[PDB]
Amino acid sequence: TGYDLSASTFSPDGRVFQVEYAMKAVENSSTAIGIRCKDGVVFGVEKLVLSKLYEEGSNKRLFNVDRHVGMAVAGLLADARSLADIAREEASNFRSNFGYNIPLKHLADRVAMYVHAYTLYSAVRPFGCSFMLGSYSVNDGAQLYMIDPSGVSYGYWGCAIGKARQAAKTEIEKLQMKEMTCRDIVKEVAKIIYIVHDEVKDKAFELELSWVGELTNGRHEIVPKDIREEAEKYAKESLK
Amino acid sequence: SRRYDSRTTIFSPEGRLYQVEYAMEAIGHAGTCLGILANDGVLLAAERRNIHKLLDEVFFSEKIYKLNEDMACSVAGITSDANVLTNELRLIAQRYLLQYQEPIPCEQLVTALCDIKQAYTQFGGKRPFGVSLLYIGWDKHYGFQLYQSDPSGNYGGWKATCIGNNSAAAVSMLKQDYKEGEMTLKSALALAIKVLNKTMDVSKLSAEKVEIATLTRENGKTVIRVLKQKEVEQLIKKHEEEEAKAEREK
Amino acid sequence: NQYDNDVTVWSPQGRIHQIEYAMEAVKQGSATVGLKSKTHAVLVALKRAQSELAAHQKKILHVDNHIGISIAGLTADARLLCNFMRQECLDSRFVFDRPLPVSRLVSLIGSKTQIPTQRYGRRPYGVGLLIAGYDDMGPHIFQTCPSANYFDCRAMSIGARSQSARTYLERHMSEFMECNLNELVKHGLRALRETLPAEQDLTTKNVSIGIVGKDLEFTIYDDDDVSPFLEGLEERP
Amino acid sequence: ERGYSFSLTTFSPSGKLVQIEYALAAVAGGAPSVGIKAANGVVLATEKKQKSILYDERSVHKVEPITKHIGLVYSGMGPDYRVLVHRARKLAQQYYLVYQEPIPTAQLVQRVASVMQEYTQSGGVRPFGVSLLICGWNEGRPYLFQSDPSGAYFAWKATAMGKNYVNGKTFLEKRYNEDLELEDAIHTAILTLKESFEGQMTEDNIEVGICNEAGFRRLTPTEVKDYLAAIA
Amino acid sequence: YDRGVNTFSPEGRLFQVEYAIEAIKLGSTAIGIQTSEGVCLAVEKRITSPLMEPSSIEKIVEIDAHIGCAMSGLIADAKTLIDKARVETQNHWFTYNETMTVESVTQAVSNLALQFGEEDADPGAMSRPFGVALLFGGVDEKGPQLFHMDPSGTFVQCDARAIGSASEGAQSSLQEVYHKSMTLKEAIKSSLIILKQVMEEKLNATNIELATVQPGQNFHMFTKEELEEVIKDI
Amino acid sequence: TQNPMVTGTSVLGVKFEGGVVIAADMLGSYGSLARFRNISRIMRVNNSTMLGASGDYADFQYLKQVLGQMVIDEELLGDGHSYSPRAIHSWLTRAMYSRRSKMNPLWNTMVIGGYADGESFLGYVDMLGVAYEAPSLATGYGAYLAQPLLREVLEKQPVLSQTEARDLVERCMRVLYYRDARSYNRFQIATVTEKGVEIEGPLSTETNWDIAHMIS
Amino acid sequence: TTIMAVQFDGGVVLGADSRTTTGSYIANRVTDKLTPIHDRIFCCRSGSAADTQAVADAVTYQLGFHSIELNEPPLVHTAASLFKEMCYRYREDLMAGIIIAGWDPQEGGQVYSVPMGGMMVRQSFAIGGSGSSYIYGYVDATYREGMTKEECLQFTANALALAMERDGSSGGVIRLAAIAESGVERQVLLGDQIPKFAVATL
Amino acid sequence: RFSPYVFNGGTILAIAGEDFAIVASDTRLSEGFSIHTRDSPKCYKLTDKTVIGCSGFHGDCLTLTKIIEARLKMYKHSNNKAMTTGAIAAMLSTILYSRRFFPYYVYNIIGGLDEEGKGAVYSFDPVGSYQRDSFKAGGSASAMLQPLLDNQVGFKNMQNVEHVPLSLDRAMRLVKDVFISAAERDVYTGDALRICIVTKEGIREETVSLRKD
Amino acid sequence: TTTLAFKFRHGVIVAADSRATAGAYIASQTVKKVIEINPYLLGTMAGGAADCSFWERLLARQCRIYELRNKERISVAAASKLLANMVYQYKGMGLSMGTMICGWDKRGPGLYYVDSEGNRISGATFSVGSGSVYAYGVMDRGYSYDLEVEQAYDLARRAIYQATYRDAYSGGAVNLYHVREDGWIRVSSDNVADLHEKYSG
C-alpha cells in the first residue's frame, strides 16, 4: 500500500509498481511478434479462441493506424483499440499539418510520450497494453518500433510481446532478419509462432498475420489468403 | 484521493466540527485582544507576543488594522490569515462605499465577513481561517458598536469582550467592573489596563508587550488614534498608582 | 484490500476488480441468446420480472431500423448506451444518408466504453449488449462486455445459467448459417429453453425476440406475436 | 491535470500546523543565512556550500534582486526559492506598471506573504520550504523583513535562519548596535557568518548583497575577500 | 470516505444502490392498483403527532392531469424528481401538442435516476442516487397504466404494486386478492382493505392519502368525505 | 470564406451506361488574371467516387485534404465497406450547409460523380448547400453554356455510350472555351467506371476561327 | 515589392525587391523580402508587411521545433504545406502572399506558391507582389526548362529589374539568393549592376 | 457580400378530404434564370399517414427534411409509436422557431390523416406559425392558386351552390388542372408533377407531365 | 390583424379578426387569432404571428408548471409579468409581438397588455393590430362597465366589423370570447359578410 496504489507515487526505493502490474497484464496475454526485414515488416499475433462460435478476424490485435503503419498489440484489447485510435488521430493531425504521411519514428515517439503522459497522474492509470508499429518508406526503408506500457519506444530488428516472447526471440535469433526477404520471413514467423504457442495451455488458437513494406507499395495490408494457407502449411510441416 | 483527502469540510459523528474547535483552541493560546465600549468612544487593547529586540517595530500597529474610514479591527491568531482577511474586509468596505456613497455600517461588514467565513467552512475542502476578529466602529444607525466573530462564522454584539488566554477571567472582570451606560473613556481605559494586567498575569504588564488603540467621534468625524509608547507608559504608571492606592486603602 | 475500491488501481495479478464486478453483473443479468443466419439475425431474451405481478420488463431495445440490441446488467447504463448508439446511427443517416454499419457502431461503443476504464472515479457501464444488425455485409452479431471489449460472434448466450445455451450454440453453430428464418428462431428459442431448468417452462408471456433480416427491418416481438414462433416446440430436455 | 481541491495543510487537534513546523524544520536543515540592518542600509549574507570543487560555485547565484532597490536571500530549498523569487519579480513589475513608482519593500513582502498564505490554505500544493530575508530601500529608509513558510512576516533589524539559528540570533543581539554604519553591519554579518560557517569560509563560499539609497547590489568576490581580510 | 460512489460489490453490484433499496423499505407504505377502469394510488401518512397538519403530509403528487405519483423514501429528495418529471411532461406537450405518455415519463425519470458521482460530469450535479421508489399511475392512449420506478433505474410496468415499510407480504396478499377483470371500485376497495390490514396504527381519513386517474376524468384526489364514504363499507 | 481570391471556372459532367465522365479546365484565375494554368481542380475521392470543383481554389484544397483524410480513416477501419457516391454527396452537402450556417462559407461549387453497385451517380452541391442529382450537371457559366446542350442531348438520347459522352463533353468544353473568359484551351477530363477512376491528364480542344474573316 | 523564384537542376534561385511603401512614401527602401525559414528553405513575402513578418516568424518557430523533433532537416513540400495551413486558417485577417522555395535531399530544388487565400501548388517559376503583373510576358518568353544556376540567377535578375522599373510599389535594390546542396549564397544588385534596358527616347 | 438565402422556386399544394389527403408539387429546381433538373419532388413521405411539402431555399429544405426525419426517429424510439399529424406539425413549428434569428426560408405544408380518418392540411411560414385548414397552397404560385382553391374546394363566393364534400377523383382532377394553369403564368413551376395521396390504404405516388418550358 | 379586449361587470370580452396577411397578400382567412392559454386564461396574436404563438405557448407551459407546483391557478398579473420578462430578455432582437391577456382570478376580472417592447400595462380596454386604431373609436364610444352580456357581445362584434371594413389588413371572420369566473366561452365566429348584411338590414 502507498507505493503500489497509483502511478503518481514512487516506491520507497523509487519504483512504479502500477506500471509493473501493467507489464504483468501485458505479459500474461497472448503472444504477438513483429519481425522487420530489409524489404518489409511482418506481424504475427496469437488469437485465443474462447469459443468456435467466434469469427476469424474477430477482436483483431492488428490495427492499421496510418496508411503505411500497422500496430500489433498485446494486453487489454479495449485499451489497445483506444491507443490505435489515438495513433490514427495523431497520424491524421500530422498529415493535415505537414501534407505528407507521418514517419514511423516520430509517430512512435509521440505515441510513447502520450502513453507516458497517462503514467504520471493519479487521475489516470498506466495503459495495460504494449504495441509494435511497423511501417515502410522509400527513403527510410522498413521500420519497426516496439512500445512498452511505460512509454518507451525502441527500434527492433525483431520483437515479441506476451507470454512466450523470450522463447520466440531466442529461437528466431538464428535468423539474420536484418537482410531477409519478407515473403519467406512470413513463413518463418508462422513457424516461430507455432512453436512458441503452447497447445496444452491453449488448445484452441488462431493466427492473424500481416506485413507492410516495399511489396505493399508502402501501404499497410493484411496477408493475402493464399499466402496464409501456404505459410500455415509450412508452419505445420515445421511442427514436425 | 479518497484515502488521502483531509475532508475538513464535512460533519462529525457527534455533531461538532473539529476544525473550528481546533481553530478556537489555537486562538485561545494565541495573543490577547480586548474590546470595550464607552459613552464617547470604543477602546482596543491588543497584546503582541513576539517582542524580540531584533524587531524594527516601525509599524503603527501589528494586530490592529483599519478596515475603512470609520471602523478598526483587532485580529487574534494566524497573522497571515489576519492580513488576507483584513485587506478583503477593506476591499468589501470600499465596495459598499462605492455602491452607496455612504460609510459601510459595521454590522453590514461583519455580516458579510461571517457569510464568507461560514461558506469557507461549509465547503471548499480547505482548513478554516483560524483567526478571531473583534471589530469596533461608528455608524449612522448605532454609533459606537463592537462585535466579536468566530472562525465558525458566528458573530455577536457586545459592550465589551476579550479573546485569547484567560478569556473567562477577562469577561468576568468586565462583568464585574464595567459600568454600563456610565463608562467614560478614562474609566474604560483603566478597566482595559486592569484586564491587560490580569488576563495575562505571566509576563506582567509591559509597555512594548501590548498596543492600545482608541476610536472616537469628534465633529462628526471618526478618529482612530493609536496610543504611543509614552502613552502606554502613562497607562502603566496610572495602573500602578491606582493599584497601590487601593492596596493601601485595603 | 485496496485493489477493488477504485477503477484506476492495478491489481498485482494484472486485472481490474471493477471490471471483474461488471463482468459478474452481466452474467447475473437475465438470459439472452442471440444468433444469426446467412441473411437474418435474431435475438431471443427472457424478460425477468421482480415478481409475478410485474410485466417482464423488455430487455431488447430498438436502436435503429436495421440494428437492434439486447441488454444484460445495469438497465440505466444500458439505456444510456442505447441512446448514445441511436444518436450515432441518426447522425450517420443525417450526414452520409446511409445506415451506420454494425461493425463501426460496435467499435464506436467500445471506444466510448474504454474511457471509463481510465478515467478517475468513473465506473464501467455494468451491462452487456448483444447487438443484432443487418447491413451491406450481411447480418452481424456482436457481444460488448462491460469490460469495454467487444466480440464478434455467430451465436452468443449471456445471463445466468447460460452454459447450456452456450453448449447448444457450439453444437449447432455449423447449421445456424444455412437454416431459414423460422428454423433459426426455433434454434435460438431452444437454446433459451435449455438455458432454464426442466421444471420451469418457456412460457410465451415472458419471452421476447428482436429480429432483423435482409428485407426485414429490426422488429421486436412480444408475448402475443411470439406465439406463432412458439409452435411445435419440444418439451424441456 | 485535475488538481486536488482539499488543502494538504490542516489544523491539528491543538491547532498547530505541524506541516508548517516540518517546513520550518526543513528551513533549519537548509543552508544558513543572516541579515542585518544599519542606520543607512541593509546587508544580507549567506553561505553556499556545494560539493567538492567540481561544482562551478561561480555559475550559480543565491542572493537575488527583485528590483534595483530590493534584494533577498533564502534559507531552505532552492527549487521553492526560484519560483518564489520569480513570482515576487512578477508582482514588483506589475506594481511598477500600475503605479509607475518602485515597489515599497513592505508591500512586496505583503504580496509574498499573501502568496504563501494562498499556498498554505489551497489544495493540492506543498507549503514553501524557505525563509526569506528581504532587504529594501525606499523613501530614504532601510527595510529588512523576515518572511516564514507559515506566511507571516516581520520587520527585523537582524535575523539568522538555518542551522544554529537561535544561537545566531543571540549572537546578533549581542553584537548589534542601533546606530551602526554599513561598514559595522558588514563586519557584524561576516563575524556571525564565520562564527557559524563550520568549515573555514572563503570569498567564493560567502555571497553578500547590500541595499542602500544607491540601490541593491551584490558584492563580487574581490571586495568580498577584501572585507573578510579587513574583518579577520 | 474510503469507499467511492462508483464502487461495486465483490458479487458485482452497487452496494450504494443496495443501501438505497434498504432506505426504500424504510419508507412509508404505498399501494398502487391498475385496472381497466383506471388506476388508484394510496399511501399511509405516518402521522407523528396530531400537531402536524395532514395537509402538508401528502405522498401523492400530480404529474399531469392524467398522471399521479406515489413516493416512498426520501420524500424531500422525491420532490425534485417530481418537478423534473412535470417539466419534462410539459416540454413534451409544448413540442408535440399532446399529453406525454406515462411510459415515456417513466423512462425519462429513469434517465434522471442513477446520474451522480464525484467527478464525472458538471460539478452542479447529483452526488447520491435517488432514494425514493415511485408508482406512476396514469391514463393515456394505452388505457390505464401503472409503473413501478425503482431507484435503480429498473423501471417496471406493473398492474399492482405495494412498496414501503410493508412492501413484501402485503404485495403477495394484494396479488392473491387481485384479479385481471376487476372494476375501479373493486380496485379501491381491495387497496383500502389491504392498507388497513397492514397499517401499523389505527388509520382514518387523516392517516391515508388516496388518489385515482380515470379514462374519462382527470387525476382526482379523494377528499375526506369521499374517503369516509369508501372506507365505511370497509 | 468572405471572397474568392483565385477561382477556377465551370466544371461539366454527365453519366453514361456503367459510369460517369467529368471535365474541368486546369486554370486557376486570380480574378481576371490567369496565374495558374496546370493545377488540378478534380480530386479523386476513391476508386469509385470523384469530385470536380469550381469557385475558390484554397477552399477546394482544404476540402480535398479533409475528404482524403476521412477516406483514409475509412480505409484504415478495414470493415470491408466503402463510402458510396451518395454518401460522399450527402457529406459534402452537410459540410457546406454547416459552413454557410457559420457565415463563413466555402466559395466552391462541386460536382460529385461516381459509380458503385452498378449505379452511375452524378451529384451537384454548391457554396449555398443546395444538393440534387441529374443526368447532366454543370457549374458556373457551364450551367448556362453546356448544361442547356447537355440537357437537350440527354432528352434526345436518355442513355448515350461512353464515347458519345466523351465527344459531347469535348464539344461542351470547346463551347466554354469559346464563350467563357475564365476558361483555358487545355483542360483535364476524367472518367469513373467499374474499372475505377481515370484522369486523362492534360487535354486540349480544337478551335475554329473561320468566322474571323467574315468581318466587313 | 516583387518576388521571383525559379528552380534549377538541383536547387533554386530566389529574388526579391527592396521596396515597401505605406502609400506613396517608401516605408523602407532596402527592405528584405526573402527570409530563411531553414538552411535550405526560403520564403518570399509580399502583401501586408506585419502579416508577412508574423507568418514567417511563426512558421520558423513551428518548423524548427518540428525539425528538432524529427532530428532531420525538413522538406520544401512540408514547409509549403505548413504555410498553406497557416494562411488558410487566417485568410480573413492575414493578407499575404508567400513563395516557398528551396532544396531537400528527397525531392531536390522545388518551388511552391501560397498567394492570398491559403492555397498551395508547385510551380517551376513563381511570381508574386504588386509588381508581379508586369512580367508574366517576359518570363513566359524568356524562361525555358533545363536552366543552370547562373542563367536562372541572370533571368531572375532581369525579370525583377523589369518589374521594379515598371512598378511604383517596387524599387531600390534586388536581393538574390541561390540555395542548393552547396549551401545558401546571397547577393544584392544595386545601381549599375542591376540590368538596365533600352529606353525609347524620342 | 455573401447572401445566405436564395429562392429555388417550387410550388406545394394540399387538399384535406373527409377521408384522404392530397399533396402535390412540381419537380422543378430553379436558380436565378437557370433550371437545374426536371426531377426534385418537394413532397417527402414521413409515415404512411403523413407527407410534407417543403418549398423555397433548397438547402434549408433538405436540412429541415432530414431534421424532421431524425426527430421522427427519436420520438419513435422514445414513445414506441409513430407520430400523429398534429404532433408533427407542432414539432416542425418548434423546429422553425428554434431558428428564429436565422430563419429557414422554406414554406411547409403538412398533409396527412388524423386518428379519425380525416384529412388534415397544416400551413406554415418561415418562422413557425401553423394552423389546420382544409386546403392550402404555398410556394412560388401560392398567390396564383389560393383564389381558385377557395372558389372550388371551399365553394366560397357562390350562390345557389350546394356543398358536396370533395372526393378523391375530384381532388386529383382539380389539382392537375390548377397546376396546368399555374405552369403557364408562373415561370418557377412546370415540366412535371409528383402527387402523394395519403389514405388508409397507404401513400400513392403519381407523376404527371406539365408544360415542359 | 385586429384584436380588442375590455373588462366589465360580468367579466371580459375579447374579439379578434381572422385575417393574416403576408405583405399585400392575404395568407389565410381562418387564423385563430385568439390563443387559449388555459381553460381560464386567454391570449392574442398581433404582429408576428409565429412569435406570438410561440410565446403564448411557452407562457402556457410555464403557467401550467406554476399551477402544478403551487396548487393554485396562476394570477393574470403574474402571468403578464412572466411573459413580459421572457420577451424583454430578448428585446431589440427583431421580435414583433403584441398581445393582451385577460382572465378571472382572485381579484375578479383582470386584463393586462404586453408587447415585444416589454411594455406591460393594465387597464380596462385595449386593442392592438392594424385596425386597432379604428376599433378604439367604436369600443370607446360604446363601452360601459355595466353592459349586459349581449350588449358586450354585439359591441365587440360591431367594433371588429368596423375595423375590418375600414382597414384592409383586417377581415375574414370575427372570433368572440367571453371570459367569466369559470373560464372562457367561444361566443361566436361570424363572417364579416354576414355581419355587414345584418348591420345593413
Curated annotation (Swiss-Prot), chain A:
It holds the Pfam family Proteasome. Its main location: cytoplasm. One of its GO terms (cellular component) is proteasome core complex. The lineage of its organism: Eukaryota, Metazoa, Chordata, Craniata, Vertebrata. It is found in: Cytoplasm; Nucleus. Keywords: Acetylation, Cytoplasm, Host-virus interaction, Nucleus, Phosphoprotein, Proteasome. InterPro entries: Ntn_hydrolases_N, Proteasome_alpha, Proteasome_alpha-type, Proteasome_asu_N, Proteasome_sua/b. The modification Phosphoserine is found at residue 238. It comes from the Eukaryota. It comes from Homo sapiens. Component of the 20S core proteasome complex involved in the proteolytic degradation of most intracellular proteins. This complex plays numerous essential roles within the cell by associating with different regulatory particles. Associated with two 19S regulatory particles, forms the 26S proteasome and thus participates in the ATP-dependent degradation of ubiquitinated proteins. Gene3D superfamilies: Glutamine Phosphoribosylpyrophosphate, subunit 1, domain 1. Belongs to the peptidase T1A family. This is Proteasome subunit alpha type-3. One of its GO terms (biological process) is proteasome-mediated ubiquitin-dependent protein catabolic process. The modification N6-acetyllysine is found at residues 52, 201, 225. GO terms for molecular function: ubiquitin protein ligase binding.
Swiss-Prot record, chain D:
The modification Phosphotyrosine is found at residues 4, 22, 74, 119. Induction: Down-regulated by antioxidants BO-653 and probucol. Down-regulated in response to enterovirus 71 (EV71) infection (at protein level). SUPFAM superfamilies: N-terminal nucleophile aminohydrolases (Ntn hydrolases). Pfam families: Proteasome, Proteasome_A_N. It is found in: Cytoplasm; Nucleus. The modification N6-acetyllysine is found at residues 68, 169. CDD domains: proteasome_alpha_type_2. One of its GO terms (cellular component) is ficolin-1-rich granule lumen. Belongs to the peptidase T1A family. The 26S proteasome consists of a 20S proteasome core and two 19S regulatory subunits. The 20S proteasome core is a barrel-shaped complex made of 28 subunits that are arranged in four stacked rings. The two outer rings are each formed by seven alpha subunits, and the two inner rings are formed by seven beta subunits. The proteolytic activity is exerted by three beta-subunits PSMB5, PSMB6 and PSMB7. Component of the 20S core proteasome complex involved in the proteolytic degradation of most intracellular proteins. This complex plays numerous essential roles within the cell by associating with different regulatory particles. Associated with two 19S regulatory particles, forms the 26S proteasome and thus participates in the ATP-dependent degradation of ubiquitinated proteins. This is Proteasome subunit alpha type-2. It comes from Homo sapiens (Human).
Curated annotation (Swiss-Prot), chain E:
It comes from the Eukaryota. The modification Phosphoserine is found at residues 9, 49, 56. The 26S proteasome consists of a 20S proteasome core and two 19S regulatory subunits. The 20S proteasome core is a barrel-shaped complex made of 28 subunits that are arranged in four stacked rings. The two outer rings are each formed by seven alpha subunits, and the two inner rings are formed by seven beta subunits. The proteolytic activity is exerted by three beta-subunits PSMB5, PSMB6 and PSMB7. PSMA5 interacts directly with the PSMG1-PSMG2 heterodimer which promotes 20S proteasome assembly. The modification Phosphothreonine is found at residue 48. Keywords: Acetylation, Cytoplasm, Glycoprotein, Nucleus, Phosphoprotein, Proteasome. The keyword Cytoplasm applies. Expressed in fetal brain (at protein level). GO terms for cellular component: cytoplasm; cytosol; extracellular exosome; extracellular region; ficolin-1-rich granule lumen; nucleoplasm; nucleus; proteasome complex. It is found in: Cytoplasm; Nucleus. Glycans are attached at residue 191. It comes from Homo sapiens (Human). NCBIfam families: PRK03996.1. GO terms for biological process: proteasome-mediated ubiquitin-dependent protein catabolic process. Pfam families: Proteasome, Proteasome_A_N. PROSITE patterns: PROTEASOME_ALPHA_1, PROTEASOME_ALPHA_2. Belongs to the peptidase T1A family. Induction: Up-regulated in colon cancer cell lines. Up-regulated in fetal Down syndrome (DS) brain (at protein level). May be the target of the transcriptional activator NFE2L2. This is Proteasome subunit alpha type-5.
UniProtKB/Swiss-Prot annotation, chain G:
Its EC number is 3.4.25.1. It catalyses: Cleavage of peptide bonds with very broad specificity. This is Proteasome subunit beta type-6. GO terms for cellular component: cytoplasm; cytosol; extracellular exosome; mitochondrion; nucleoplasm; nucleus; proteasome complex; proteasome core complex. The 26S proteasome consists of a 20S proteasome core and two 19S regulatory subunits. The 20S proteasome core is a barrel-shaped complex made of 28 subunits that are arranged in four stacked rings. The two outer rings are each formed by seven alpha subunits, and the two inner rings are formed by seven beta subunits. The proteolytic activity is exerted by three beta-subunits PSMB5, PSMB6 and PSMB7. (Microbial infection) Interacts with HIV-1 protein Tat. It comes from the Eukaryota. GO terms for molecular function: cadherin binding; endopeptidase activity; threonine-type endopeptidase activity. It comes from Homo sapiens (Human). It is found in: Cytoplasm; Nucleus. GO terms for biological process: proteasome-mediated ubiquitin-dependent protein catabolic process. Induction: Down-regulated by IFNG/IFN-gamma (at protein level). Up-regulated in anaplastic thyroid cancer cell lines. The modification Phosphothreonine is found at residue 35. Keywords: Acetylation, Cytoplasm, Host-virus interaction, Hydrolase, Nucleus, Phosphoprotein, Protease, Proteasome, Threonine protease, Zymogen. Belongs to the peptidase T1B family. The active site is at 1 (nucleophile). Its main location: cytoplasm.
